[PDB]
Amino acid sequence: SSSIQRTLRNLWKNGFKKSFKQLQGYNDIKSGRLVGTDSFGNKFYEVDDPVEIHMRTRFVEYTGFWRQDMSEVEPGWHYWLAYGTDVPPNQLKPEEKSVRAYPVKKHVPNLTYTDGAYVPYNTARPKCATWDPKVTERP
Amino acid sequence: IPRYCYHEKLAVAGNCRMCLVASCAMPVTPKIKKAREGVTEMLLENHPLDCPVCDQGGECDLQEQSLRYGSDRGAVENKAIGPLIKTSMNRCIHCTRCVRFLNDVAGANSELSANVIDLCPVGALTSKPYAFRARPWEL
Amino acid sequence: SGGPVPVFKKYTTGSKGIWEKIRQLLTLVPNRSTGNPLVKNYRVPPPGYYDRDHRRNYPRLVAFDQTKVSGLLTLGSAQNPRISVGEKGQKELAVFDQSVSLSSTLATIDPKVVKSELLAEGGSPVVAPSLNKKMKFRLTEESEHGMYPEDYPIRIFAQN
Amino acid sequence: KSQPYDAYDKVDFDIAVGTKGDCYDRYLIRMTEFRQSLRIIEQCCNQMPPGPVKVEDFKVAPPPRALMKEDMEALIHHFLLYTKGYAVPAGETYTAIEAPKGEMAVYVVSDGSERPYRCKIRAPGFAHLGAFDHIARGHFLPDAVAIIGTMDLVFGEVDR
Amino acid sequence: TNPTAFAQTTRYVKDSTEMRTLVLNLYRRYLRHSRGFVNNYNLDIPASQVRTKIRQEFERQRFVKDLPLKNVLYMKAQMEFQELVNFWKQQCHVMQYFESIKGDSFVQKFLKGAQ
Amino acid sequence: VISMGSCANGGGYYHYSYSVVRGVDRIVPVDIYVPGCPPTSEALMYGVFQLQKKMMDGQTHRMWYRSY
Amino acid sequence: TDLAKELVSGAPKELITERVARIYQETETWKIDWDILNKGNRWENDLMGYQSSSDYMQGTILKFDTREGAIRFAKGQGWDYYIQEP
Amino acid sequence: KDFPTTGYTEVRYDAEKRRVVYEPLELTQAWRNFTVGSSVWEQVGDGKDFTPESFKLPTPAPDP
Amino acid sequence: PTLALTSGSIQGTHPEGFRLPRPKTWEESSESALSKATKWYLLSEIFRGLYITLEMYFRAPYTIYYPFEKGPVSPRFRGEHALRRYPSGEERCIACKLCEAVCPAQAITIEAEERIDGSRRTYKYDIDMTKCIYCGYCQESCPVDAIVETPNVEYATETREELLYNKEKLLANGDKWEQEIQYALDADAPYR
Amino acid sequence: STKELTTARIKDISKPDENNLQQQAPNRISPWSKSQKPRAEAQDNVRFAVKDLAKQPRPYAAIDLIYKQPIRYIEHDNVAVCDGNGGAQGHPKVYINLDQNKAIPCGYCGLRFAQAAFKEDIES
Ligand SMILES: CCCCCCCCCCCC(=O)OC[C@H](COP(=O)(O)OCC[N+](C)(C)C)OC(=O)CCCCCCCCCCC
Ligand code: SF4
Ligand code: SF4
Ligand code: SF4
Ligand code: SF4
Ligand code: SF4
Ligand code: FES
Ligand SMILES: [K+]
Ligand SMILES: [Zn+2]
DSSP: OOSHHHHHHHHHHHOHHHHHHIIIIISSOOOOEEEEEOTTOOEEEEOOOTTSOGGGSEEEEOSOSSOOOGGGSOHHHHHHHTTSOSSOTTSOOTTTSOOOSSOOOOOOOOOTTSTTOOOOOOOBOOSSOOOOOOOOOOO | OOOSSOOTTSOOOOSSOOOOOOTTTSOOOHHHHHHHHHHHHHHHHHOOSOGGGOTTGGGOHHHHHHHHSSOSOOOOOOOOOOTTEEEOGGGOOOOOHHHHIIIIISOOOOSSGGGHHHHOOSTTEEESTTTTTOOGGGO | OOOOOOGGGSSBOOOOHHHHHHHHHHOSSTTOOOOOBOTTTTTOSOOOOGGGOOSTTOBOOOOOOHHHHHHHHHHBOSSSBOOOOHHHHHHHHGGGGSOOOHHHHHHSSOHHHHHHHTSBTTTBOOOOOOSOTTOOOEEOOHHHHOSSOTTSSEEEEEOO | OOSOOTTSTTSOOOEEEESSOSHHHHHHHHHHHHHHHHHHHHHHHHHOOOSOSSOSOTTTSOOOHHHHTTOHHHHHHHHHHHHHOOOOOSEEEEEEEEOSSSEEEEEEEEOSSSSEEEEEEEOHHHHHHTTHHHHHTTSOHHHHHHHHHHTTOOHHHHHO | OOOOTTOOOOOOOOOHHHHHHHHHHHHHHHHHTHHHHHHHHTOSSOHHHHHHHHHHHHHHTTTOOOHHHHHHHHHHHHHHHHHHHTTOSOHHHHHHHHOOOOOOOHHHHHHTTOO | OEEEHHHHHHOGGGTTOTTOOSOGGGTSOOSEEEOSSSOOHHHHHHHHHHHHHHHTTOOHHHHHHHHO | OOOOTHHHHOOOTHHHHTOEEEEEEOOOSEEEEEOOOSSSSOEEOTTTOOEEBOOTTTTOOEEESSHHHHHHHHHHTTOEEEEEOO | OOSOTTOSEEEEEETTTTEEEEEEOOBSSOOOOGGGGOOSSOOSOSOBOOOOGGGSOOOOOOOO | OOGGGGTOOTTTSOOTTOSOOOOOOSTTOSSOHHHHHHHHHTTHHHHHHHHHHHHHTTSOOOOOOTTTSOOOOOTTOOOSEEEOBOTTSOBSOOOOOHHHHHOTTOOEEEEEEEOTTSOEEEEEEEEETTTOOOOOHHHHHOSSSOEEEOSOOOOOBSSGGGGEEOHHHHHHHHHHTHHHHHHHHHHHTTTO | OOSSSSSOOSSOSSOOOTTOTTSSSSSOSSOSSSSBOOHHHHTSSGGGTTSOGGGSOOOOOHHHHHTTSOOEEESSOSEEEESTTTGGGSOOOEEEEOOSSSOEEOSSSOOEEEEGGGHHHHHO
């Protein structure tokens, strides 16, 4: 798993363009079978290489080239990447697939350090209402 | 000595059978423990599974006497009696405490008719303005 | 016993072909596994009433002051009675309804009674009772426990 | 061994005992316990019995969810367990176990309610650190590092 | 084992005359170490002000009558002394000790919500 | 400064204790807060990666040129 | 009995000078709680609506087995107290 | 038992003083007392006696 | 007849051979002087330790490349909280306040009333994530499975305010993570 | 108008525009509870001065979604049984009486059950 034969073998499979991207973020040239792609654009791969060690059989390719944020991974594939399930969310049974009664928009990553960061607030009204003053003529 | 139908401010009843040694009506052990378990199951035979959504939850006499003197293993339409008492008769344990107050003390639509919420040991009759707003351990 | 086990009988990833022979040639202890879990065997399937009311039959906390302890040496016990009968019986027990010093009781009583109840085994002192009477130990040897030989400054104790 | 608890009486293991009472003796003892635990782990894996894992009492343990949503008595016990807890009869206890650091014990006082009246936690590292001045006198500054590490001091346990 | 520096063994004094001498001896030790307190804790006040502060605390308990309260007060005063001399207190705690200090009228408190 | 875990963030289990600071940000400025009791190693690494992302957005020398 | 144990307790002076305690039998034990502050007992947090407080005795409820114990303890601490007769 | 669980004072760093200082306690969310849900009934009974017969007082015999 | 006659005990008896034997002298060794000096001067055991270390240099390391790879997770994992809906879009929580009472850290604040349509619903559900101990008691106590912890762990924030989750934030997490929540519930269903 | 944004009503009087960030929910304009703070008043704070309102969490209102489900109808029975449509992962099972001539919602789900013989009256 640390030999140069594995690296050269994976370098030949991916090509220069894909391997140079792995040489910039991944720190490791790796190859695998495309398993799916989430709604954010990440590509998820699985490795059949017999020399890969236990926890390294699944990996992600991020959309960016210089920065990679783990929160960009869609929740469907977040569980699969962590070996939570052997069924990728693009192979789910009709019964096992969640049913939503609201529209589903594009995956939004963690918004901290941006203007979109979550702002907490009290969702309840004031517990007492002040009297609205009304004046009546004195008889 | 457990009870559901005993209250010294009202007339004597023997329609709950939880005071066996009915000691409430009668003037002055494993069988008794078994008897209390047997009576407790009868009340819970038809009782709806409403404790999470029921206002008597933390202050329910049926709950406490099911825990204390019972085993741990085991459809009536509502009515309207005014905007002050919320009626869910599915939970009634048929103890006739409401009848004794409404006819003997109240004399009835009354200025005291809201006291039946106190006497009803279960969530059959509950305060309507108070509904769903608090739990007795919060107060 | 937990003697040495060959490397191929351990659920790790080893060597193959010419590289296994080389590994056996250059390892001081060649039967030691590499420690890397097997991919094809390890974690392949991913994880994704009153009769029994013993709490309410709890033992009751009962204390023994000098008054009741004196009563046992004087009046005996319910298992080994030494008490009178009738109205005489109730006269003697009502003596221990108020303060009765045990040191005063120990002054005037037959030692044949003290050595039978207060002490044990005919005057033998009462020894601190053990929490587990099955606690025994025995020294063993390296051919048994498999740990360090005798020249190391520790020893191994078995159940005995 | 002294006060067995929770299926330690149904397994086999040996205790390593030193003779010189220094840091090297305790290192060997802790290395033996490594192998004695692995001996127990194998036995438990081969002797795990079937049956319930929690006490069959819904006044202490939560009922299953499937039973909670169909049985009225299960729903009451689930409601009461999570809103009041369970009452514990009044009393007190001093229960000790063989914690990896040493003897860890708790002195719990119950007032008959669903909250503990008093809970004193006896920390093995608290007593070990109270003997450090007696042990470390004479030794040099690098030896204090060894003495600290041979006591297995986790200060959350010490301070709590 | 050995006790830390400036440690005294705890003893329950049963004589008011003997208690009075022990208090006066300790009061002298506070005054003598006053210049040390200014040095170690880097205070912004002269040692003369420190000695004045010490006297005020001793003057607060001047008229305590009960002997059992005297022993507990004396024991706690010894612990504080051992704490200050050995530099166990952090400098922030000693600085705030000298940070300690006209009450408003009824209307003044009424306007701001009082206490 | 990275604040890790519920104790350092806001006190956590010991929030209502007489001897606990209810958040390390009462004493020192905090740049990122990592949640969890404890945060996993990956949760901490993610927090570090967020800080490294913010550090790569620093404009200290262009601040001198364009803001001073 | 008459010892000023508040001098060596370590509690602040306001328990003796300002705060007032109540002794009551609520139905088998006697309890001691403190009367609320006129101001500062509660105030709504503007951020998340939490109930803020500056009353450090708000959650303290002493328990006693007899009426004599509750009164004796309160006097021993120099507390200003009133007994709520049952 | 009379010492409140949150104490009386709290620390914070004072920018003007350049140091950490103690201040009287104030809580953004006061501690909530759910303990008031103490059962109006007793749960455990009177228990079962396990005193050894060798330590119980003897009983007088009936009349001859 | 016990050992109580001599104040003895069964536990007091040391086993046979408990007393340490006589310590050896210089003449009672098994190795010659040159044998012990060759292991000493030539550092026999030190060189062996180096060789063992050099063996590890040729083995596969354990390191995984986070965030491109993730460590294993289980359906019982406790992470970021989220409120859940029924498939129809209705909230599961009936504002029953069970999770508020259980919560060991008192990190949950609930205010409830009657909805306009008449349902027992909450209008205020806050979890202080800087106070929670991620202990799962709220999830275990919920009778409708409304409150859950998702396997998410990567939600670190710049400010401490962002860790004050209100009902809108918690419901948004439930919508975001509903599919991953479904994985854990289905797998962990038999054991709950 | 500021009235449909700060008052609690049974039904919205106008069409909910999901791009309007002043609405209580993307699908509902007015708050659905009397103690619920209007979303317009909540966002008028110092902490929202330089924040992007579009990215703030805005879950859809459950009150609007639950009532778009069709009324369930029972044939040849007077009692409706509901258990969350999930069994062990639904809600506790309850029995709903259908004597009255109206649709009675479930105590947990909110699904409104009715008798088929009462269909025409309820649809009116
Ligand atoms: C060639 C130049 C490099 C190495 C030079 C020094 C090597 C050690 C010499 C003293 C040996 C000695 O004293 O031997 C004493 C011992 C063994 O003897 P025992 O305990 O009685 O054996 C017990 C009975 N048997 C004989 C049946 C086994 O041997 C050793 O532990 C040998 C360890 C060498 C393995 C590691 C080799 C690589 C080391 C790193 C090199 C960079
Ligand atoms: S009346 Fe009591 S037992 Fe029945 S649902 Fe309500 S709380 Fe539960
Ligand atoms: S409605 Fe309430 S008070 Fe009346 S009989 Fe039923 S349980 Fe008793
Ligand atoms: S793991 Fe939890 S209790 Fe421990 S230090 Fe971290 S936040 Fe505190
Ligand atoms: S996980 Fe535990 S501490 Fe966290 S909110 Fe739930 S009950 Fe409270
Ligand atoms: S336990 Fe579940 S239903 Fe009850 S208040 Fe909490 S989230 Fe809502
Ligand atoms: S209390 Fe006597 S039968 Fe009801
Ligand atoms: K009621
Ligand atoms: Zn339903």
